[PDB]
Amino acid sequence: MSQKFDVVVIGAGPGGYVAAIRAAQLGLKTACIEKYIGKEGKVALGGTCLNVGCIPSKALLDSSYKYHEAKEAFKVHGIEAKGVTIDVPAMVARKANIVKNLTGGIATLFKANGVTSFEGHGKLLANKQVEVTGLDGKTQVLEAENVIIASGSRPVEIPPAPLTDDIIVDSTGALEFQAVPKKLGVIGAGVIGLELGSVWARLGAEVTVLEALDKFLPAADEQIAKEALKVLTKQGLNIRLGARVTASEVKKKQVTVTFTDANGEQKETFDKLIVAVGRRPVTTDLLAADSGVTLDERGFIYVDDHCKTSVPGVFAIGDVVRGAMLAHKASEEGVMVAERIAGHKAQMNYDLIPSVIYTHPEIAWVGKTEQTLKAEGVEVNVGTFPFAASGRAMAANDTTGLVKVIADAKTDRVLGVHVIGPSAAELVQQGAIGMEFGTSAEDLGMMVFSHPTLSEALHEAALAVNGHAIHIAN
Amino acid sequence: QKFDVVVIGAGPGGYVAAIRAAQLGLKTACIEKYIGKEGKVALGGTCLNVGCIPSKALLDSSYKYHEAKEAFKVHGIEAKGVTIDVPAMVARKANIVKNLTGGIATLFKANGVTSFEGHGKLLANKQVEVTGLDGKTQVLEAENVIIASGSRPVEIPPAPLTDDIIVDSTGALEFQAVPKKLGVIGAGVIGLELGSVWARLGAEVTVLEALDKFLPAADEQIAKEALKVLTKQGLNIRLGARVTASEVKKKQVTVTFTDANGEQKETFDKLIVAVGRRPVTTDLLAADSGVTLDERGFIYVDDHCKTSVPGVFAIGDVVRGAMLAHKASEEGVMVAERIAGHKAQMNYDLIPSVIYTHPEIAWVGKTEQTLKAEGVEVNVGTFPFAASGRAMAANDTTGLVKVIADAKTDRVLGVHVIGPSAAELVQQGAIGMEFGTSAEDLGMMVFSHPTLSEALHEAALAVNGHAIHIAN
Numbered sequence: 052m053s054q055k056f057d058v059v060v061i062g063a064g065p066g067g068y069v070a071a072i073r074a075a076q077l078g079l080k081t082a083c084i085e086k087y088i089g090k091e092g093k094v095a096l097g098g099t100c101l102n103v104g105c106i107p108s109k110a111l112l113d114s115s116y117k118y119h120e121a122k123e124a125f126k127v128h129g130i131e132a133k134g135v136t137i138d139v140p141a142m143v144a145r146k147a148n149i150v151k152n153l154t155g156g157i158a159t160l161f162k163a164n165g166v167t168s169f170e171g172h173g174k175l176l177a178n179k180q181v182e183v184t185g186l187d188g189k190t191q192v193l194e195a196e197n198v199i200i201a202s203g204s205r206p207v208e209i210p211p212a213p214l215t216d217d218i219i220v221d222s223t224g225a226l227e228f229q230a231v232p233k234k235l236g237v238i239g240a241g242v243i244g245l246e247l248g249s250v251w252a253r254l255g256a257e258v259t260v261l262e263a264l265d266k267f268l269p270a271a272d273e274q275i276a277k278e279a280l281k282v283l284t285k286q287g288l289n290i291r292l293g294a295r296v297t298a299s300e301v302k303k304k305q306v307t308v309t310f311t312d313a314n315g316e317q318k319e320t321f322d323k324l325i326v327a328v329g330r331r332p333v334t335t336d337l338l339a340a341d342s343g344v345t346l347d348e349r350g351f352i353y354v355d356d357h358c359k360t361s362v363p364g365v366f367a368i369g370d371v372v373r374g375a376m377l378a379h380k381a382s383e384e385g386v387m388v389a390e391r392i393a394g395h396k397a398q399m400n401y402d403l404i405p406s407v408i409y410t411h412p413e414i415a416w417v418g419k420t421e422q423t424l425k426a427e428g429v430e431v432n433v434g435t436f437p438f439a440a441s442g443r444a445m446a447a448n449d450t451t452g453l454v455k456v457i458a459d460a461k462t463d464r465v466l467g468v469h470v471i472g473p474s475a476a477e478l479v480q481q482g483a484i485g486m487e488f489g490t491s492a493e494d495l496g497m498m499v500f501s502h503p504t505l506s507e508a509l510h511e512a513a514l515a516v517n518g519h520a521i522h523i524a525n
Numbered sequence: 526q527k528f529d530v531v532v533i534g535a536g537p538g539g540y541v542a543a544i545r546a547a548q549l550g551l552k553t554a555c556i557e558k559y560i561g562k563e564g565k566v567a568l569g570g571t572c573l574n575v576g577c578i579p580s581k582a583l584l585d586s587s588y589k590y591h592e593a594k595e596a597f598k599v600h601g602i603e604a605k606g607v608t609i610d611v612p613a614m615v616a617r618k619a620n621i622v623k624n625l626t627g628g629i630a631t632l633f634k635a636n637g638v639t640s641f642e643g644h645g646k647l648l649a650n651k652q653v654e655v656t657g658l659d660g661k662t663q664v665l666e667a668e669n670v671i672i673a674s675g676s677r678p679v680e681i682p683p684a685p686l687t688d689d690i691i692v693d694s695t696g697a698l699e700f701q702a703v704p705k706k707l708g709v710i711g712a713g714v715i716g717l718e719l720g721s722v723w724a725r726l727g728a729e730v731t732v733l734e735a736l737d738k739f740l741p742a743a744d745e746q747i748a749k750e751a752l753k754v755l756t757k758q759g760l761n762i763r764l765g766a767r768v769t770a771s772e773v774k775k776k777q778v779t780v781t782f783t784d785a786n787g788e789q790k791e792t793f794d795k796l797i798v799a800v801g802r803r804p805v806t807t808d809l810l811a812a813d814s815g816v817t818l819d820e821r822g823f824i825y826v827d828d829h830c831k832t833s834v835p836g837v838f839a840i841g842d843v844v845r846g847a848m849l850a851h852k853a854s855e856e857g858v859m860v861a862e863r864i865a866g867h868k869a870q871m872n873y874d875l876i877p878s879v880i881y882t883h884p885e886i887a888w889v890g891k892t893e894q895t896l897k898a899e900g901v902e903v904n905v906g907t908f909p910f911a912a913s914g915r916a917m918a919a920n921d922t923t924g925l926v927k928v929i930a931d932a933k934t935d936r937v938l939g940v941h942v943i944g945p946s947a948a949e950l951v952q953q954g955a956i957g958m959e960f961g962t963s964a965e966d967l968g969m970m971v972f973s974h975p976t977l978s979e980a981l982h983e984a985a986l987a988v989n990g991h992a993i994h995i996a997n
């Protein structure tokens with residue numbers, strides 16, 4: 052029985068580790084297999100998000116912002132912070148210690164819940180048998196009643212900019228720089244590139260972001276994206292749209308990138324270059340030829356709306372399957388799959404998954420953009436409120452940005468909430484909770500919002516939908 | 526001199542009522558007497574001029590200084606020193622107040638509200654006498670009157686305001702230097718906020734509180750954590766300490782008070798009287814206006830803020846209910862809408878409370894102790910910020926979220942937070958409660974990761990024993 056489990060989970064990222072905990076909570080005998088070696092030379096749980104993704108990036112964003120504010124936005128308060136500096140090794144070490152604590156915390160949760168951990172590489176064979184290759188190279192086979200595949204993702208590689216020495220790096224290396232890159236190039240103006248560029252720009256890097264697409268943040272609401280581009284450019288992110296990298300050359304501890312833009316061939320030289328074009332699903336040695344599990348043309352594991360693969364009792368969740376490649380999407384899929392194995396008719400809502408970009412100002416949204424609703428032919432009413440009119444934001448010395456609420460013009464149902472500014476993600480979550488209950492704009496308007504709080508900007512934007520905000524002209 | 530609506534007072538109640546009435550097409554006047562820093566009438570009431578906004582401005586500046594002094598090294602951030610210039614900090618606050626008070630006048634002009642400068646008094650038959658700043662009078666004929674005269678600090682005989690030594694909250698927001706030893710009478714929201722400002726800047730702060738129980742309206746678990754954290758921050762909060770006398774000598778003040786061990790004395794450079802707030806009706810009502818006051822000096826109104834006189838309403842701090850700015854403003858909206866013919870109502874059950882200490886404290890709905898006293902069986906779920914990845918990244922892990930749900934129906938009955946973004950997380954809870962959320966409803970929603978909001982999600986899951994990120 053040592054080798055028999057009700058649920059075997061391959062991977063311990065946000066998808067897999069949450070699925071494993073939930074399965075154990077539901078009374079299923081659960082194993083979770085993980086191969087990733089952390090900084091101490093031992094297996095570290097938590098996946099991309101904890102080890103080289105969400106948490107490390109937010110740690111560096113928060114440290115670098117605190118330095119930036121001390122250097123550039125203290126005098127208005129009367130604060131004199133003389134000769135303020137930030138030590139990059141110490142900043143990175145704080146991040147490493149946070150990662151170590153949280154990865155240890157997952158192991159603590161596994162122990163408390165009775166999840167059995169295996170260290171090594173898992174491979175799905177036919178008929179729900181899972182071969183585990185341990186760290187010593189020895190194999191064993193686990194007999195699973197159900198398998199949850201949660202093998203995650205890795206950075207996209209591009210031929211013009213292969214990882215090279217410590218000069219051309221991906222996001223993992225960008226979270227490990229021990230000195231500020233004097234000239235930093237970033238390929239890709241999506242969330243990851245914008246966050247990483249912001250960290251290092253705050254510390255003095257001169258940053259160019261090369262983006263092949265003509266449109267900035269095309270999935271975000273256009274009004275939000277336009278303000279974001281303006282603000283981030285002013286902060287020193289030299290974001291170049293319609294700029295397609297074709298070659299790179301490393302010499303003298305620098306890298307020269309050749310790229311094509313509207314004016315032809317261009318060259319620019321950097322001390323470090325981050326390739327942040329996107330993310331790809333990981334299926335390396337994951338599926339035996341006889342497993343029965345199929346991949347789509349983009350390399351994701353094919354699953355249905357309940358994350359079931361083509362093989363009964365085999366599920367796949369998170370970044371290895373279709374849908375938004377986000378940590379909270381992966382974890383909610385894990386919960387849904389575990390609940391369904393336990394017999395519950397659990398159903399995931401894919402329409403209210405929020406997005407957050409942890410720049411400062413923060414950017415977040417839920418639901419549909421104005422441009423999507425126009426393409427769908429839905430008439431809408433829009434309300435906005437700027438943080439420049441927020442008393443709380445004035446006290447905070449942080450008045451950039453706005454809240455936008457989009458409602459159906461016929462029914463008043465809120466269809467999207469979009470924010471750039473302080474506490475964007477928390478205000479968007481307020482909107483998402485309302486949308487879960489079918490809120491109208493008038494419903495939000497009729498609620499008591501504490502004063503003074505940043506939340507009031509959502510209240511006013513909801514009132515503005517129907518032309519009766521108090522604190523701005525309508 | 527004829528108006529559909531005459532509003533007395535331009536604080537959060539009155540100025541919002543005036544704007545909403547004007548938006549509804551009612552010919553609206555608003556009367557205000559308060560003189561701001563430029564020597565002219567300033568709108569916005571207590572909250573904008575000497576209350577909410579100034580206090581938050583000094584709290585935010587002082588916290589940024591505190592974090593630089595005490596919580597930068599862990600990030601790798603060093604400095605040769607950090608100082609704060611108190612006059613400059615206060616001047617930033619004064620400029621914010623000036624901008625926002627000007628903004629209300631701009632809103633009045635855009636909406637067509639007519640302003641009068643002076644003291645408004647309700648006479649018989651809905652006539653309003655306005656005494657101008659030169660003492661000359663005129664009478665306005667009002668179809669409807671909205672009384673929004675607000676509040677002022679409570680004065681106590683044993684600590685009368687004196688020179689620059691014994692002050693109320695208004696004086697405490699105007700210190701031009703850090704007091705070396707600062708005494709505060711009253712450990713409520715105002716006293717804790719003001720004490721926090723000056724403690725962060727180096728004052729030795731004692732807070733004398735007559736009640737044995739700290740923050741009795743807050744949930745007991747939150748209040749216990751708050752007392753521990755604020756004491757650690759240097760607020761020497763003395764419970765069961767009743768002030769009986771004070772004496773000023775040589776620009777210092779000795780306070781006599783009684784505690785469990787008998788009569789005590791303590792000497793301070795400055796003393797803040799922050800025991801509470803009282804409704805203002807000074808010269809507000811003619812003897813035959815028809816409007817009645819209760820025994821505590823509030824104007825008596827029904828649940829629609831209607832007085833004993835038809836067409837006369839009263840809102841905000843001068844009437845029953847929570848003395849909070851968002852309560853006053855929403856009452857103003859209700860009254861304006863009702864004058865315009867709508868059967869508008871006010872929800873008194875989900876008014877949140879916020880204390881802008883750091884960590885911030887906020888809550889909505891009922892406490893565990895209230896529900897026990899009511900005999901309502903409950904399930905409780907909590908989640909600590911020490912287990913939040915977002916909070917760890919923020920270097921700010923003090924506190925917790927608490928969700929209380931009915932044990933039979935699973936309906937959320939209260940949400941209580943001490944920690945980062947407490948007010949925003951409480952607002953999430955309040956929105957859910959408006960829609961009748963259960964704890965499981967919140968648990969089934971997708972919360973972005975990593976965000977502080979996830980602490981509310983986990984606490985909601987913990988109600989029914991299945992949080993993912995803490996043992997159940």
Ligand SMILES: Cc1cc2nc3c(=O)[nH]c(=O)nc-3n(C[C@H](O)[C@H](O)[C@H](O)COP(=O)(O)OP(=O)(O)OC[C@H]3O[C@@H](n4cnc5c(N)ncnc54)[C@H](O)[C@@H]3O)c2cc1C
Nearest residue numbers: 062064065066098099100104105173203204369370377378
């Ligand atoms: C720099 C960066 C910043 C990000 N910021 C955020 C953010 O703030 N918020 C957000 O929502 N998302 C963010 N993301 C995306 C987020 O990291 C992913 O969406 C999330 O980690 C996906 O979770 P998952 O469990 O599907 O996969 P992963 O987190 O990739 O976990 C997969 C696990 O499977 C292991 N594994 C793979 N194959 C095997 C095998 N055969 N046997 C054993 N183990 C195996 C891997 O070692 C890994 O631990 C960020 C990503 C990056 C790179």
Ligand SMILES: Cc1cc2nc3c(=O)[nH]c(=O)nc-3n(C[C@H](O)[C@H](O)[C@H](O)COP(=O)(O)OP(=O)(O)OC[C@H]3O[C@@H](n4cnc5c(N)ncnc54)[C@H](O)[C@@H]3O)c2cc1C
Nearest residue numbers: 534536537538570571572576577645675676841842849850
């Ligand atoms: C230090 C402090 C901090 C505070 N912090 C907060 C907080 O963060 N959040 C919150 O919700 N609440 C806070 N409050 C409470 C908040 O200020 C009040 O709840 C709110 O201002 C009440 O609004 P109101 O319109 O009823 O009265 P007020 O704001 O007091 O306005 C009444 C107006 O009427 C004027 N007036 C009175 N009589 C007349 C008359 N006869 N004729 C003409 N004009 C007249 C007054 O000059 C005044 O401008 C704070 C209060 C203080 C003292």
